[PDB]
Design a protein around this nucleic acid. Structure first.
Ligand SMILES: *[C@@H]1O[C@H](CO)[C@@H](O[C@@H]2O[C@H](CO)[C@@H](O)[C@H](O)[C@H]2NC(C)=O)[C@H](O)[C@H]1NC(C)=O
Ligand SMILES: *[C@@H]1O[C@H](CO)[C@@H](O)[C@H](O)[C@H]1NC(C)=O
Ligand SMILES: *[C@@H]1O[C@H](CO)[C@@H](O)[C@H](O)[C@H]1NC(C)=O
Length: 178
RNA sequence: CCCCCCCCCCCCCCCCCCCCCCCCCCCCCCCCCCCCCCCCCCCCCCCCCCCCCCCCCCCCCCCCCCCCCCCCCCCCCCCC
């Protein structure tokens, strides 16, 4: 009957989240999982495949430095919020969030975001996305179709980045209308 | 039919340097909040001790009065 589980700063050595870490939570109807401040460094594929009813996943304030292949979110069929702010570095790809179309909140502040300007936008499948946070990442380049199709977006945080060149009339190809 | 040598222009890539722009970290100063300790001022409280004042109680002392008992002395009258 477990619906809420907080594991914030509960461990000394939890560096890698393999596909066997949460197998003991398979039969729990877990909705909220908090994993902040655990010095987590790597998330493997199918790490959260055992949490099918999960709605909130908080992974901020860790040392996660990797490239999000998108397989880390397999099995998250009811997820609504993913918190990833204040990690080492996150590199996005075409299918980083292709397995979680039900996502509504995505926080990516202070993660030193890389490759957010992919030709197919990493945020394209997120049709229900409402809140997106990309602040304090020193992002310099954004394509005009980064947020295409996100008709439900309501909050967009882009402060403390470097987007000045994109809005200059002398920028090659003209200003970026994102 | 075939090589080599010059000229301009257009490039590509790797380094160096200089620019704005931004991020992170740190330093200096200031401000705010919280915590701890300490000082100063004023109004008080309780307890103890000392002193003073009022009132009261008990005991005692001094003086006086009353009653009882005891003793001495004065008048007067009878009995044998
Ligand atoms: C996960 O747990 C952490 C730590 O308990 C929560 O972080 C706190 O969040 C509140 C509200 O945002 C802040 O006021 C506190 O300062 C935070 N504490 C720390 C140490 O950062 C976090 O909110 C939890 N996440 C979820 C989704 O519940
Ligand atoms: C976890 O991944 C390993 C490596 O791919 C695999 O051998 C193993 O069967 C997986 N565990 C489960 C429970 O699927
Ligand atoms: C997005 O939200 C709408 C409205 O609640 C819903 O119909 C749709 O199923 C959602 N999409 C996903 C993938 O959950």
């Amino acid at each position: 009957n477990l619906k809420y589980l907080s594991l914030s700063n509960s461990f000394t050595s939890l560096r890698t989240l393999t596909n066997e870490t949460f197998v003991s939570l398979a039969h729990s109807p877990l909705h909220i999982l908090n994993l902040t401040k655990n010095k987590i460094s790597k998330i493997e594929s199918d790490a959260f495949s055992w949490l099918g009813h999960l709605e909130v996943l908080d992974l901020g304030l860790n040392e996660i430095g990797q490239e999000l292949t998108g397989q880390e979110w397999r099995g998250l069929e009811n997820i609504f919020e993913i918190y990833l702010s204040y990690n080492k570095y996150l590199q996005l790809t075409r299918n980083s969030f292709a397995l979680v179309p039900s996502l509504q909140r995505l926080m990516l502040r202070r993660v030193a975001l890389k490759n957010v300007d992919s030709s197919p936008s990493p945020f394209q499948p997120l049709r229900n996305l409402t809140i997106l946070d990309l602040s304090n990442n020193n992002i310099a380049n954004i394509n005009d179709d980064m947020l295409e199709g996100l008709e439900k977006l309501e909050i967009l945080d882009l402060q403390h980045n470097n987007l000045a060149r994109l809005w200059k009339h002398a920028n090659p190809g003209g200003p970026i209308y994102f």
